[model samples]
Target: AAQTNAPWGLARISSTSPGTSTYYYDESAGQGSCVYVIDTGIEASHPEFEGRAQMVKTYYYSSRDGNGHGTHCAGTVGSRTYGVAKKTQLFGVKVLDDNGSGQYSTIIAGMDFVASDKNNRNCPKGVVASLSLGGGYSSSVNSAAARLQSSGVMVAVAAGNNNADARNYSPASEPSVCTVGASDRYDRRSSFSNYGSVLDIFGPGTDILSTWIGGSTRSISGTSMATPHVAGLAAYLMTLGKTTAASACRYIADTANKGDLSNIPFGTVNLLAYNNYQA
Candidate 1:
């Protein structure tokens, strides 16, 4: 938030893909929030994070990213170049293992840790959790999200990549969470993105370039990818004093850019997502 756009480094380096923001850098660059990427893990040494990416905890396996999915999503969440909020504390809590799969109980444990300050009292301020993983509905997970919301933490989750409705999923359908779907660079919904009244927003997810494991970078696509964009955006918004989940959700739903989209989904032909940056 601070009406900022991409980072100065993003403009200086040609290889860095510009995010959804289409204006000059504002330098706020997501400076005041702490983002928890509850996914596979993070490459703590990725240069884009500038040493801000911290493996704060691991729910199942080592925080080291055996698979690059978590790191990639983390990059797009706040890696200075591919992120929507480029200057926040990026913490990774590995819920998924090398194969990108984890028991629902494992994921709930990850959520429980981030949602509470009991484990580490020093968890950063303006807390936001980005979950790019999903499965069938679980009341435990739903309860966890509700607990976080009650405690004033914003949780952003993937609406699922099934190319079906998000209503049938867990965290996506779960209340008090911001569920996201994939949209391409063209501002069109990705073919594989799940859409439904349950979804909170859509974001750039197709062929998105971001930090990878081994201090490298790559591009991938999915609703999982899209989840982080809104997560970054939510973190940014939180810095602007949108503290409560209800306030943040209302602000996003009210102020999001809405326009014509080709796909006929459960909602309207005019879908909404982040489209404005710093001027």
Candidate 2:
């Protein structure tokens, strides 16, 4: 499966028009505000980007793109998803190497970076940390990230892509994280997405295409893809008016597409009903 340029539009149009970012732009072309991205380093050369996705700060734990994992996650947060909030600033933290593997301490350091004073320029108050990478149900990542959140930073982490109900790893299983599960574009709960009381909310995830290294692309699966949809929306609300992550989460939770997913194990989530009043 070759990847398309309209990362989010690829799924929005169901692979029809392979290279259009218009679908997402039509929704939030100029609605986003600055939101730091803590994934792989961004591809500054992508054509679809038009001076948007402002790279405010750039730091990498690894020297280069390890396995394109961080790059993919980065694209979802800033690049046009099947839904993108067009204007957002990004602070990139490359904690892992080109191999997509890094020590937990490095990831902790990344979280520290998000809450650190050095990023005050990009993150005046702090950023809502979004993570799509996870290995277990409990790890040091959770503790350190929680510590950051306790300091008022909102942390969003992906539930494992394994499709089971049990918590997958440290951050995902933690109470402080906005444990994002996955959902299909059709508004139905994805069978492979995690479903439990721990799951906070599910966003668009299935059949997601995003940027890879060398400015290439690929379509992949995982709750990882879904995390950014919410992250982007959060950025939108922040730019649209909402100032805090907790408030932004409440807004999305109130407006999300609630199809056949209301009675599911994860309870009701409706992000569309949110009243931000900024529009």
Candidate 3:
């Protein structure tokens, strides 16, 4: 019944061993921080959110999540039942449409919204942005993410699902963002996860379960699923006083479990995201 017995992604980050089934963390984790889920949108009414999640901005037609991607990602970031930051404020910044696709311009607009909102807020603990989407290299997108980071929002992005070098992607290749790849229960690289030096860390992404649209839950995979885990961890770190994006990013990378993952491409970092909790 304890949180330690939660989801594998949550459990995996708290323990050093790959076979652990417990998750450990501060009781007040993510209490004063916020994480913006920049994706398709969120099902704000999902029971898992406990009224902590809301749609704050949208570039798409509706603020509702028709594709379910944003809801799942938001759940992983802060839902009561499936989140990493259980108490972190969840804000849905919809950039993609029902088909789970969008243009660079819309994505940039979403980033701008996060930057502006973060600047106007008093989140002294810290602020984070979970970006579960990415594509080929786009200077505009990269610059937007960089600007968000410069504005003090810890940005976590997907390392793409191409299975090739993540350096070929936009936000992932952006040095200022925390680019994440996917790993399975055994601490092995997910076959479709893009790798190489661009990745900052890996998270449990294969068949991961989280809240979905229509007040339900679903299991899915992709670097997309892997990203929110890091975003949540970053938010948790923020609550621990790593208020700056650079400080949180360094702490996440420094405290990560090194050489614990298998099949990581030659140039990829072999670090797995850790919540710095030991049960």
Top candidate when judged by TM-score against the true structure? 3
Q: Which of the two, 2 or 3, has more lDDT?
A: 3
Ranking by lDDT: 3, 1, 2
Give the number of colliding residue pairs in candidate 3.
1
Report the C-alpha lDDT of model 1 over 124-146, residue by residue, as the tens digit. Answer: 43677888888987788778777
Segments in model 2 whose C-alpha atoms lie over 4 Å from true places: 1-32, 51-62, 80-83, 123-126, 166-168, 266-279
**Candidate 3: tens digits of C-alpha lDDT, residues 44-160:** 998899988879888866798999999999999999979888988888888999998899999999998999997665566788999999889989999999999888788999999
If the candidates were sorted by their TM-score against the true structure, best first, what order would they fall in? Answer: 3, 1, 2
For all candidates, what are the clash counts? 0, 25, 1
Ten residues in a row with the worst lDDT in model 2?
Answer: 270-279
Q: Give the TM-score of candidate 3.
A: 0.97
